[PDB]
């Protein structure tokens, strides 16, 4: 009953004998499977996550200047030297200024100067390498009546999924992504994570780490002064306008692609296939409503004593003679006395009568389908 209400929904019917169903799973989309002698199931790809990811490079977006030291030298004299020049944490630049009597020198000419400032990074961006081999696909299987979750990885594509009271299925899948992971990088900022190109990330003009390499990308020296580029947080958001975000910070992470699956319904069974037909009265708990795909959903309460039994439902014609409609929910059951059952029906185009129960005590509902 999971796919009921979902807009992007696909109905897949099995082979004449059953045993196997070919389906395609993607984020947002819901798949309803139908097979002869097998129960109706609801398949949905909840999450796709990268388990083991190797770190490639870490850039600096937010920085600040600290402890500025200036070393001055008059003409003819040697070049100025500072202890901060050999230290990797400090950024140093060498230049020559016009020195003389006004500057405080005995001789006139270009005098050597060196400025050193401490580089401190507060905001850093992480970039992890992606691989198709390390991708965990979470598929939820729900029966027509919170379901059962299953993990799929290219290493272990086929997984035997157990469904209590309904037996079990063999879920064999194949990951098919239209994006080349060899040319992609999983870049993480604060809480959110994006899927960006490999070259774009490596060509970013910011200081990076395998001590920061290329510190001059954010620190600018003014010959008379040190200036910082500020926070590149907003600068990234503008460039990430076209890039698809994996994790949103809420925990919901998804990758653009399709998961082609071949569900083996060999050992699957319908709960209550041996149940007798309900003899007692039936009453509508909730009025029958039409879905976005033309199918109708109805809630019925059992008033008899023959429980656990099978709900007798038939979609008959205008003159209520021959059955001209099919039931999606495979073999609906009434568990106990005064129990509510959810049923998905497929009425034909035009006038149709839904008969729920047995004999004259049976409930009759009129329905009209447009198109």
């Amino acid at each position: 009953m999971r796919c009921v209400g979902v807009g992007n929904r696909d109905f897949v019917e099995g082979v004449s004998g059953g045993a196997w169903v070919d389906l395609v799973l993607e984020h947002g989309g819901c798949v309803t499977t139908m097979a002869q002698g097998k129960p109706t199931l609801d398949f949905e790809l909840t999450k796709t996550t990268a388990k083991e990811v190797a770190l490639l490079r870490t850039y600096c977006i937010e920085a600040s200047i600290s402890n500025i030291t200036t070393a001055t030298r008059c003409p003819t004299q040697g070049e100025p030297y500072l202890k901060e020049e050999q230290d990797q944490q400090y950024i140093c630049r060498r230049d020559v200024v016009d020195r003389g009597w006004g500057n405080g020198c005995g001789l006139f000419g270009k005098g050597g100067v060196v400025t050193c400032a401490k580089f401190s990074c507060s905001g850093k961006i992480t970039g992890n390498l992606v691989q198709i081999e390390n991708l965990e696909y979470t598929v939820v299987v729900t029966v027509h009546n919170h379901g059962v979750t299953a993990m799929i990885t290219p290493r272990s594509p086929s997984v035997e999924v157990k469904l209590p009271d309904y037996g079990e299925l063999t879920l064999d899948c194949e990951p098919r992504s239209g994006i080349d992971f060899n040319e992609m990088i999983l870049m993480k900022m604060k809480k959110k994570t994006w899927l960006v190109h490999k070259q774009w990330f490596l060509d970013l003009p910011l200081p990076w780490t395998a001590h920061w390499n290329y510190k001059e990308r954010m620190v600018t020296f003014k010959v008379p002064d040190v200036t910082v580029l500020g926070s590149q947080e907003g600068a990234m958001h503008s460039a990430l306008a076209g890039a698809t975000e994996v994790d949103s910070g809420d925990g919901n992470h998804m990758f653009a692609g399709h998961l082609k699956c071949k569900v083996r319904m060999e050992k699957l069974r319908i709960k209550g296939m041996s149940y007798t037909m309900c003899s007692g009265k039936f009453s509508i708990d909730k009025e029958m409503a039409e879905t976005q795909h033309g199918t109708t959903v109805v809630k019925v309460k059992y008033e008899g004593a023959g429980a656990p039994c099978k709900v007798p439902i038939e979609i008959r014609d205008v003159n209520k003679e021959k059955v001209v409609g099919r039931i999606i929910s495979s073999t609906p059951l009434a568990e106990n006395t005064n129990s509510v059952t959810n049923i998905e029906l497929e009425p034909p185009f035009g006038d149709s009568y839904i008969v729920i129960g047995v004999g004259n005590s049976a409930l009759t509902l009129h329905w009209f389908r447009k198109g």
Partner: antibody
Amino acid sequence: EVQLLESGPGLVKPSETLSLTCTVSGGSISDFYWSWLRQSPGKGLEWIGYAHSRVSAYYNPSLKSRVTISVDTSKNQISLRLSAVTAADTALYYCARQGTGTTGVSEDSFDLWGQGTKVIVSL
Amino acid sequence: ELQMTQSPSSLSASVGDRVTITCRASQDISIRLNWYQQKPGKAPKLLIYDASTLESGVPSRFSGSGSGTDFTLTISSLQPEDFATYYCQQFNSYPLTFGGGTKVEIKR
């Protein structure tokens, strides 16, 4: 040979949480369905629930509210976590391989059984 | 909801005798039933799976019968190795429930 070894402790005070481990040796843990079962005179063989490395765990409605079973592939062990433990929980805990059809012998049939761990509940 | 009741609680028989262990279910479980053997101190051992199919290594004397509600475990010729407690379990509906148990003792 595929072996199942149960780890204690076999003494838990009432209201405290009971923790038991089942190590799978001489076989891959990530392929089979592993289930926990308890035995005590007056209750007999009681099925607690099963757990899988890739598939979600399922438990008995009698213990579901206070029981948690998980599969640790890195440590090759199945952990059983029973909370709000009472005097009725005093039983011999077994860890067994729940069959499917392709694995074991047949669907939901415990072929490989553990040694068993005696758990006593008292102050 | 579904209750598994096996009769008798205890059984007294000699070596060579034909024993009959009956397992009853409150609801229809079809051919879905498993039989187990348990000796004191040792873990249970599966003998008959799918109500009639015998497990590998289990002697020809052991036989499985029944479908739906009433089930039967039969040992054509009892042996000293066969004296243990016998259990029956269902797998048609969850949770998986076990029977009361039938202890087969030596007739003296």
